[PDB]
Structures are given as structure tokens and as C-alpha cells.
Amino acid sequence: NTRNFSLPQLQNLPIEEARIVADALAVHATSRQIDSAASKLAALAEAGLKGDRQAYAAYQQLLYVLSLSDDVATAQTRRWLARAIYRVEERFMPAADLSRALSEEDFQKRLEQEIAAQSRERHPMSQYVFSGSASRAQLQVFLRHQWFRTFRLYRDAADLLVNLTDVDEAAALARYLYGELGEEDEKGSHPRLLAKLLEAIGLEADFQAVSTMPEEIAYLNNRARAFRHAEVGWGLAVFYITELVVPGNHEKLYRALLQAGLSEDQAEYYKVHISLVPPRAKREWQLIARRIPDVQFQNAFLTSLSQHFRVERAYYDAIWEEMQS
Amino acid sequence: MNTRNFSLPQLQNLPIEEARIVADALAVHATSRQIDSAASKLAALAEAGLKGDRQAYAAYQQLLYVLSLSDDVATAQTRRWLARAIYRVEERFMPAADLSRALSEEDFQKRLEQEIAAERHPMSQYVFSGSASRAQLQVFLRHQWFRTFRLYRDAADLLVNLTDVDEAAALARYLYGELGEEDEKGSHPRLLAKLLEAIGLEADFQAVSTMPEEIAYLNNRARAFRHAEVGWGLAVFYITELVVPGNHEKLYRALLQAGLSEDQAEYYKVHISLVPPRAKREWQLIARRIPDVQFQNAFLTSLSQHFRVERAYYDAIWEEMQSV
Ligand SMILES: [Fe+2]
Ligand SMILES: [Fe+2]
Ligand SMILES: [K+]
Ligand SMILES: [K+]
Ligand SMILES: [Mg+2]
Structure with missing residues (x-):
């Protein structure tokens, strides 16, 4: 009943960014550990969306843990970190880019x-x-x-x-x-x-x-x-x-x-x-x-x-x- | 209109320095410095109000009311982030149940x-x-x-x-x-x-x-x-x-x-x-x-x-x- 909690999933990821995310989810984590996680995650998503296949798999796996784990004690900080990744993702998505509203x-x-x-x-x-x-x-x-x-x-x-x-x-x-x-x-x-x-x-x-x-x-x-x-x-x-x-x-x-x-x-x-x-x-x-x-x-x-x-x-x-x- | 319980109009109408710091942190483009500055100033204001400063009490409760219960969803995630900084101080001061082992149902x-x-x-x-x-x-x-x-x-x-x-x-x-x-x-x-x-x-x-x-x-x-x-x-x-x-x-x-x-x-x-x-x-x-x-x-x-x-x-x- 902790198999889909954030820490057990992070410990199965050999990447250093998973250790940094784990530190930001600790009970006594401060703004420094949280901001450091956000910056490393954003950089990892940037590298993967630019074409680094290893970074791409890593950031998608970390976003999955951040956004969909079931330990509610870490949910607020996890969703904070997810938003840092989302902002990078939405930059890369093709956008509708309408200048005026279409008619109904x-x-x-x-x-x-x-x-x-x-x-x-x-x-x-x-x-x-x-x-x-x-x-x-x-x-x-x-x-x-x-x-x-x-x-x-x-x-x-x-x-x-x-x-x-x-x-x-x-x-x-x-x-x-x-x-x-x-x-x-x-x-x-x-x-x-x-x-x-x-x-x-x-x-x-x-x-x-x-x-x-x-x-x-x-x-x-x-x-x-x-x-x-x-x-x-x-x-x-x-x-x-x-x-x-x-x-x-x-x-x-x-x-x-x-x-x-x-x-x-x-x-x-x-x-x-x-x-x-x-x-x-x-x-x-x-x-x-x-x-x-x-x-x-x-x-x-x-x-x-x-x-x-x-x-x-x-x-x-x-x-x-x-x-x- | 029906958007007067949005956070920025309310903060603009609060003539205290912490309201400007909070409003800057709620901007979608707010930096980590701006958000962490607001969190620190709110936590200090709440602690002063809880220790008998009547002006700080009224100020922090008004700011927490704007943060936790305004209706502009664009700022809600950061608003709730800052609210938690206040909650952590409040809960430190609350008398707490101290069971060492769980009671039966x-x-x-x-x-x-x-x-x-x-x-x-x-x-x-x-x-x-x-x-x-x-x-x-x-x-x-x-x-x-x-x-x-x-x-x-x-x-x-x-x-x-x-x-x-x-x-x-x-x-x-x-x-x-x-x-x-x-x-x-x-x-x-x-x-x-x-x-x-x-x-x-x-x-x-x-x-x-x-x-x-x-x-x-x-x-x-x-x-x-x-x-x-x-x-x-x-x-x-x-x-x-x-x-x-x-x-x-x-x-x-x-x-x-x-x-x-x-x-x-x-x-x-x-x-x-x-x-x-x-x-x-x-x-x-x-x-x-x-x-x-x-x-x-x-x-x-x-x-x-x-x-x-x-x-x-x-x-x-x-x-x-x-x-009456
Ligand atoms: Fe259904
Ligand atoms: Fe009811
Ligand atoms: K942010
Ligand atoms: K929310
Ligand atoms: Mg009758």
C-alpha cells in the first residue's frame, strides 16, 4: 500500500535528479531544496524535449511520480514541482495561436x-x-x-x-x-x-x-x-x-x-x-x-x-x- | 462587478507593506525570491499576531483570508503555497492531542x-x-x-x-x-x-x-x-x-x-x-x-x-x- 508512493518510486530511479526530488519532499525540506529540485527538473525536461532520449524518459518518469503518486503528505510540494515541468512542456507544444476569437x-x-x-x-x-x-x-x-x-x-x-x-x-x-x-x-x-x-x-x-x-x-x-x-x-x-x-x-x-x-x-x-x-x-x-x-x-x-x-x-x-x- | 473577491483587487485595497509583497508573489511571472520573501514575511507576521500584537493579528488574518478564499484561479496554487507558510506557524501554537498509542474504535x-x-x-x-x-x-x-x-x-x-x-x-x-x-x-x-x-x-x-x-x-x-x-x-x-x-x-x-x-x-x-x-x-x-x-x-x-x-x-x- 506504499508501492505507488513517491519515495519508493524515486528510489527505483538511478538518476541524480531523483535524489534531489526526494530531498525536496522531506518533512523538513526548505525553499532551497524545493527550488533546487524545480530547477533540475526544468533543465531535464528541456534537454529531453530538445531530443535527448535519456533525459526524455527520465523527466517523464519523474513527472509521473510527481503528479500521480498517492502519498498525500507530499502532494502539495509534488504538484509545485510538476508545474515547473509543465511550463517547459507547454513551450514546446504547437499552439493554436488565434489572434481573434473564432465565431461560434x-x-x-x-x-x-x-x-x-x-x-x-x-x-x-x-x-x-x-x-x-x-x-x-x-x-x-x-x-x-x-x-x-x-x-x-x-x-x-x-x-x-x-x-x-x-x-x-x-x-x-x-x-x-x-x-x-x-x-x-x-x-x-x-x-x-x-x-x-x-x-x-x-x-x-x-x-x-x-x-x-x-x-x-x-x-x-x-x-x-x-x-x-x-x-x-x-x-x-x-x-x-x-x-x-x-x-x-x-x-x-x-x-x-x-x-x-x-x-x-x-x-x-x-x-x-x-x-x-x-x-x-x-x-x-x-x-x-x-x-x-x-x-x-x-x-x-x-x-x-x-x-x-x-x-x-x-x-x-x-x-x-x-x-x- | 462579480470579480471583486479576486485576490489582486483585495490586496491593492490593503494599505500594509505585506500586501504589496504578497501581490508581487501571486503574479504568474513571480520569481522564487518573490514567493519566498512573501512566505517569510507572512510567517513572521502571523507569529507576531499570535503573540499578542493586535495589528499583526488583524493583518495576517486578512491576508490569509485573501490567500485562502479568493476566487481568481490563476493565482490559486501560489496562494495556497503561501497559506501553508502561515498554517505551519498557526499549528505550532495550537494545543494538541498527545495520544501515545491509538484508542480503540x-x-x-x-x-x-x-x-x-x-x-x-x-x-x-x-x-x-x-x-x-x-x-x-x-x-x-x-x-x-x-x-x-x-x-x-x-x-x-x-x-x-x-x-x-x-x-x-x-x-x-x-x-x-x-x-x-x-x-x-x-x-x-x-x-x-x-x-x-x-x-x-x-x-x-x-x-x-x-x-x-x-x-x-x-x-x-x-x-x-x-x-x-x-x-x-x-x-x-x-x-x-x-x-x-x-x-x-x-x-x-x-x-x-x-x-x-x-x-x-x-x-x-x-x-x-x-x-x-x-x-x-x-x-x-x-x-x-x-x-x-x-x-x-x-x-x-x-x-x-x-x-x-x-x-x-x-x-x-x-x-x-x-x-438590534
Ligand atoms: Fe465513467
Ligand atoms: Fe448541506
Ligand atoms: K513557480
Ligand atoms: K488547488
Ligand atoms: Mg406556521
Whole structure:
């Protein structure tokens, strides 16, 4: 129950920057140790994003420990250090760079255009599991990685809730979280429903799971960054693409599981996501509609969307390679 | 406008040197020097105020109020960073529970009840008796607004620090109820706004308190709910929500006697539970942590400190109520 705590993960990293981060997380750490960690981390991320493959792997691993470890005693300082890395990352990302706000029509047109080109539904990994062609072993590979995406999604959504100062917008995210965490029954939380499916196909569902897939780490790192961003356009973009527009995959996966011999109860995880409302008829769309006139929101939202698609594609490509190797 | 509870406007209107240092540290481009300078000056100011300097006390509590409870999210992470520098000083001075070994679950539940027993406040007896004028009820409800209107945000900070999925689920159920279930017009802040309108008061979602004891109460409650040792936050959650049915039932009855309709007083009615606190699912948040002595000491320390700031606040409300 400390396997996903910061110190045990840092001690498994031979790099000197991991020792410096450990010092900044100590109980008696001062501003000197914390600032020293922040400077070394920023330099490491800079070197990796400029093309140093070793620095790149190291900074992504350290950002994963900083942003997603479960020892709350170190969380405030860990997120402080993560922001030093995020500032470097956002410098390197291609940016929307609009000078004036798109019209509401033009904004929605751009949104629709990008989703068509990049939807997770068109990826070989998705259609292959859609088609019913996956073996049980390949379904296990798919679902081991679905675990990492699902099991702490609600925590990222809670970070956006904390950043929504308007009481009615906070209410919208609380309704989302209530559904995600099982309404009146904790055993129906969507992490626990997925745990039930994993156990049905002979996998363990580890709530202290730590990924060793580089593309998965990058995906989870990005998702946490976006949902925590003080400019909520970043988090709303990932929330929109991953919750307001994905009831279609889960219907195709639910059907595929029932064909593979799974019961409706064991496949409940995908069933409970099947939905009927278009994205703009969802009450959460108002949070985006409200902000469309502000070009700063438009730039953050569109930049977030494109970066999400890039890391999602690399991740899904890597799962596919694992399924075919 | 509705951005006057942002941090920079408030700091600009505070004519003391520490306010300029803090404002410079909140800029997105602030350097480590600027942030560390503010943290040092705030910690020194808090220590002076805690040791009997009345001007420093008023100054640090006002700065902590701006840091911890302003609504501009652009500065929130650094604001909370600086707030912690003050919290570390405050907690040094607080009388602390000193259990050397953890109590049993049944012994711990009995011990926290003894803290509650240690209400009978003259204001509570006066209001519950039906003796208050509508002008006096206005005094009480003006301050109820400050306690209620952003309570959900403090509970959300506790949710963030509850790593177990089932414990997060319990707080999400609380937040769902607190924010109106399927209908945001029924969120508990908006239910209270309806009651305030009924009695003749405005309900301002950008309200800023000027009562020192109320500021101290809200500052403490945010600190406790945000603490990385969640014994602090679960202690105040136990008080502010799990064991308020009796108080809110008596207030509900008093407001009906004052001529409010059931609908107008819905805010209080929805808090009247049908079972005692141990029979609620939220109790498992506390029962699961009881074998941990650090949890127990933080929980008891937080209870006592919460009751100290609550009593000073209730005394000050009562003084205001008697003056009308
Ligand atoms: Fe879900
Ligand atoms: Fe409530
Ligand atoms: K910084
Ligand atoms: K925060
Ligand atoms: Mg009557």
C-alpha cells in the first residue's frame, strides 16, 4: 500500500535528479531544496524535449511520480514541482495561436473537423476489438491498459471541479463525479465495475498500479496536466472529447464482450456508459459555450485538444503493437 | 462587478507593506525570491499576531483570508503555497492531542463525543425559543450565509486528498446532495439564498466578511479541510455535516414559528437526518482510519481548535444580535 508512493518510486530511479526530488519532499525540506529540485527538473525536461532520449524518459518518469503518486503528505510540494515541468512542456507544444476569437459557428466547425480526423474509434486497436477478432489474450492486453485510463479518471475530473468557481458549474461536475463513482452504491463506481470485468477474464485490478509503458505514462501525465490547468480551457477540452463525445465506443465494446462470452453483469462497465444525448445537448456543454467568445479560452482549448490527440495516438499505437507482438 | 473577491483587487485595497509583497508573489511571472520573501514575511507576521500584537493579528488574518478564499484561479496554487507558510506557524501554537498509542474504535467515538459535550449558548437558546425578532433573525442568517455558501468547496478539497476510491465515492455523494442532485437550482447555497430573500436579505456569491471572528472561522475551516493529514478535515466534516441535524431541526422549527413557510425554510429541513451519525455511510471514513494514532491526534486537535474558533464567532454574532 506504499508501492505507488513517491519515495519508493524515486528510489527505483538511478538518476541524480531523483535524489534531489526526494530531498525536496522531506518533512523538513526548505525553499532551497524545493527550488533546487524545480530547477533540475526544468533543465531535464528541456534537454529531453530538445531530443535527448535519456533525459526524455527520465523527466517523464519523474513527472509521473510527481503528479500521480498517492502519498498525500507530499502532494502539495509534488504538484509545485510538476508545474515547473509543465511550463517547459507547454513551450514546446504547437499552439493554436488565434489572434481573434473564432465565431461560434467557426469554432464548432473546427471542433467537428478535428474530431473526425482523430477519433479513438478509428484506431486499429479499437476497430480490431470492435470487430470481435481479438483473442482472450489480446483482450487481456487491451483491458490491462483500459485499467490505467479508467481507474483514477475521477480524480482528474475532481481537479477541474476545484477550479470551477461558479456554483452551477461546480454542480455540473459534481453530477458527473456522482455518476462516475456509482451514485448510491460504491460497488458501482466505474473503477470497481472495470475491476469486476478484469477479474472475470483472469486479470488483477490493482488500485496501486504503476505503468511501465512510456506512451501510457505520457498519456496519464498529459491528462492530469490538462485537468489541473488554471486555464480551464485545457481541462474542458479533454473532458469534452473523453466524456461528452464517447458513448459510441462503449456500445461497440459491450457488444464485443458479450460476443466473447462475457455476461451482461461482467460487462456492466461498458453498458453503463452507453448514452443518447448529443454533445451540445449535454448540460456540461454550457461551460464551453459560455467561454467561446474569449480568444484565450479558444487557444487553450484547441491547443489542449490537439496535444491530447497526439499523446492518445502514440499510446494507442503502442497498445496495438503490444497486442500484435 | 462579480470579480471583486479576486485576490489582486483585495490586496491593492490593503494599505500594509505585506500586501504589496504578497501581490508581487501571486503574479504568474513571480520569481522564487518573490514567493519566498512573501512566505517569510507572512510567517513572521502571523507569529507576531499570535503573540499578542493586535495589528499583526488583524493583518495576517486578512491576508490569509485573501490567500485562502479568493476566487481568481490563476493565482490559486501560489496562494495556497503561501497559506501553508502561515498554517505551519498557526499549528505550532495550537494545543494538541498527545495520544501515545491509538484508542480503540469504541473508545475513540466516546472521546470525540466528550469534545462536543464540552448547544447551550445563550444565542441558541434565545433563537430556538422563538423570542427573536425578524431583525434579529436577519443577523443570524447574514452569518449563516458565510458558513454555507462555499462549504462545498472545502469538502471538495477533502475529496481530493481521499485516495481510496470508496472514500472519494462517499464525498462525491455528499457533494451531489450539497449541489442539488439533478437540479442546480436546489443546491444548498441556493436554498439558503431563497431563505435569505424570504427574510429580507441579499445573498451575494462574492461576499467578503468584515467580522474578525467570522474570518477566523472561515480561515480555520479551509485550513482543516485542505490539510494533508485528513484527520483535520474529517473532524470538521463530522461537525459541519454529520452532526448538524439537531441544530438545523431546531432552527427549522424556529423559522416556521417566525412565519416562514416550509418551502422558504427548505435549507434547514433538508439537513434533518433520519438516523444518528454512526448509522450514516460517511462514518466509515472515520472508522477505517481509527487504528492510526496520528489520525486520532490530528482529529482531536482539529475538533478542539474548531470549537475554539466557533465559540468566539458565535459569541460575536450574539453580541450583534443583542444590539438590534
Ligand atoms: Fe465513467
Ligand atoms: Fe448541506
Ligand atoms: K513557480
Ligand atoms: K488547488
Ligand atoms: Mg406556521
